[PDB]
Amino acid sequence: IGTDKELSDLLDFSAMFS
């Protein structure tokens, strides 16, 4: 996916797998 990829590829993990 995109949008703040640099921030997502390092921050947050549960909010995406939940």
11 near other proteins (CB under 8 A): yes
* 12-to-1, 2, 18 alpha-carbon distances in Å: 14, 14, 11
Residue 3 makes contact with other proteins by CB under 8 A: no
Q: Residue 7 interacts with other proteins (CB under 8 A)?
A: yes
For residue 9, state whether it binds other proteins (rule: CB under 8 A). yes
The reply on whether position 13 binds other proteins by CB under 8 A is: yes
For residues 8 and 1, the answer to whether their CB atoms sit within 8 Å is yes
Residues of this chain that interact with other proteins (CB under 8 A) are 4, 6-7, 9-13
